[PDB]
Specification:
The structure is cut from a larger assembly and holds 4 copies of chain A. By secondary structure, chain A is mainly alpha-helical. Chain A has 5 helices and no strands. In chain A, helix 1 runs antiparallel to helix 2, helix 1 runs antiparallel to helix 3 and helix 3 packs antiparallel against helix 4. At the A-C interface, helix 1 and helix 2 of A face helix 1 and helix 2 of C. The structure holds fe (iii) ion (4 copies) and magnesium ion (2 copies). Chains A, B, C, D: One of its GO terms (biological process) is negative regulation of ferroptosis. Chains A, B, C, D: It comes from Homo sapiens (Human).
C-alpha cells in the first residue's frame, strides 16, 4: 500500500485508469478529425484547428487524471489506445455530430465514475470529478450542439457554401 | 438560535469545534518541529523554515473554520491545545514521517466531518470541506510522502550528508 | 489520385503512416515514464518533467508527419497505439537506458524510410526526413547517452543519492 | 573555365539556365492572371493581389537561380519568355486550376534537375534545389489544391457569389 493512500478504494483506482484510457482515446479521435480537414480535398483550416485544439485539451484531461492517480497513491496502468471509428469523417457536420456523440460517451463514463466515488464515500474524488470534468463536459456538449444546429440550419452537409462560411465566421 | 442559522445541525457545529482544536494542535506540532531544526545541534535552517510555514498554514486552517462556524450561526468553544507527542523530533526524516502521520490524522477527521455533513444533508458544509480542506490534505500528504521517499533513497537518517543536501536542494 | 500528388510512391505513403504510428507510440512511452517519476515512492520531479516534455515533442513529430502526408496527397490511416513495454520503469538510470533504446529504434525506422525515399527518387521526402528528423534523433541519442554515462558514473541505480543529485543538477 | 568552377557539370549549368527561363515564364503567367482579375468585368481585387504576389515570388525564384549560376561559375544565357497560354482566364476557379497545373509543371522541371544533379554527384546543387525550391513547390501545390477544392464546394465557377465570398474571406 502507498504511504499516501487514504480512503481510496481499489475500484476507484481501476475506474481512474479506465477514464485515463478514454481521455487518450478522445485525444486520438480529435487528432484524426483535425487532419481529415487538413486534406487537400476537404481543406477547412478552422475545422482542422478546432479539432487539433480539442485533441491537445483531451491529452491535458488524461495527464490531470494521471496526476490524481499518483496524488491518491493509486498506480497507473496504460492500455492500448484503439484507433478512431472512422478514417474519413465525411463532412464538417458529420465530424461535429461524431464529436458530440464522443463527448456524451466521455460524460457518461465520468458520471459512472462519480456514482462509484459516491458509493465508496470518496468526497475528494467526487470534488475532483465535479470541479475539473463535469462542467467541462456540459460546456463541450452545449458548444458541439450549438455547432451542429448552425451547420444543419445553414444547409450542411449538402451546401459546401454552408461549411466554408461556418469555418470562416464561427471557427475562425 | 442565531438569526442566520439554516440547515446547520448541532452535531456539525460540535464537529467543527473539534476540527478547530485539531487544526490548532497541528499548528503546535509544526511549531515544535520548526524550532527543533533551529537547535545549534540540528541546524537545518530550511527544515525549520518549512515547518514554521506549515505551522502558520495550520493557524489559517483553524481561523477559516472559526469564520465558517460564525457564518452558519454556530458558536465557537475553544479547548486546551495538547502539547505535541515529542520534544525532540530525532531527524529530518523522522519529523517528515511524523508530519505525514499528522496530515493523515487531520484528513481522517475531515473525512468523518464530510460523512456527518452528508448524513445531515448539509451541501454548504460538504462544499466548504471539499473546496478548502480535502484537496489541501491530498497535496500536503503527497508532498510529505515525496519528501520521506527522497530522504530514504538518499540514505537518511544515518547519512547526515543526505539531510544536509535535502535541506539545500529540496527545501531551499 | 489527389490533385496535389506528384512523385509520391504508394510505398512511401504507407511508410509515413507506419512512422506516424511509431511517433505516437514514442509519445506514449515517455508519458508512462513521466508519471512513473511522479509516484510518491519514486518522487523525482525533474525526471517526470523531462519525460513529459519528450512526450509532447513526440506528439509534435507525429503531427508534422500527418501534415506531410496531406501536403503530398497521401491519406492518413491511424492504427491502435500499443501500450509501452513496462508499467514500472525501475529507476532514473533504467528509464534513460530504455529512452536511449526507443530513440535508436525510431532513428532506425527513419533511416529505413530515407532508404525507401532514396530508392523511389523522392528528394522532397529525403529533405523532409533530413531537415526535421535525423539530426533531432542524433541530438536526442547523444543527450540520452550523456545522461546514462553520468548516472552510471555517479553509482546509479544503487545510489538513490546519485539519482536525487542528477535530478537536481542536470534535469533541474 | 571559371576560376570558381568545381564539380559543376555542363549539363547542370544548361539545366539551371532552362529552370531560370521556366521561373520567368511562371512570373509572366501570374502577372497575366493578376490583371485579368483587375478587369472592370471581373473585379476580384484579392484574386488580383494573390496572383501579383505569386508573380513577384516567381521573379525572386529566377534571381536566386541566376545568383546560383554565377556562384558555381556557370554562365547565364537568357531565352525569349513566351506569352502565357491564355489572355482571358475565365474565372477565379479556372485561374486557380491553371496555377496548380503550372506549379506541378515547375515542380516536374525541378525534380528532373535534381535527378541530373544526383547523376552528376553534385550534392551542393541537390542541397540548393531541396532547400530553396522543392518544399516551396509542395506548399504552393497544396495551397492551390486547397483553393480549388473550396471554390468547387462553394459552387464555382457557376456561382459568382462563391468567387466573391472566396475573394473576401480566403484571399483577403
Ligand atoms: Fe476529456
Ligand atoms: Fe490543517
Ligand atoms: Fe520522434
Ligand atoms: Fe518558381
Ligand atoms: Mg457532493
Ligand atoms: Mg464543490
Amino acid at each position: 500500500t502507498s504511504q499516501v493512500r487514504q480512503n481510496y478504494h481499489q475500484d476507484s483506482e481501476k475506474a481512474i485508469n479506465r477514464q485515463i484510457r478514454l481521455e487518450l482515446y478522445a485525444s486520438y479521435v480529435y487528432l484524426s478529425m483535425s487532419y481529415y480537414f487538413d486534406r487537400d480535398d476537404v481543406a477547412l483550416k478552422n475545422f482542422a484547428k478546432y479539432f487539433l485544439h480539442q485533441s491537445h485539451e483531451e491529452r491535458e484531461h488524461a495527464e490531470k487524471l494521471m496526476k490524481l492517480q499518483n496524488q491518491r497513491g493509486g498506480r497507473i496502468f496504460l492500455q492500448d489506445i484503439q484507433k478512431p471509428d472512422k478514417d474519413d469523417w465525411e463532412s464538417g457536420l458529420r465530424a461535429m455530430e461524431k464529436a458530440l456523440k464522443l463527448e456524451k460517451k466521455v460524460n457518461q463514463s465520468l458520471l459512472e465514475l462519480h456514482k462509484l466515488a459516491t458509493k465508496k464515500n470518496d468526497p475528494h474524488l467526487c470534488d475532483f470529478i465535479e470541479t475539473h470534468y463535469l462542467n467541462e463536459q456540459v460546456k463541450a456538449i452545449k458548444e458541439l450542439g450549438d455547432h451542429v444546429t448552425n451547420l444543419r440550419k445553414m444547409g450542411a452537409p449538402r451546401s459546401g457554401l454552408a461549411e466554408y462560411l461556418f469555418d470562416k465566421h464561427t471557427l475562425g
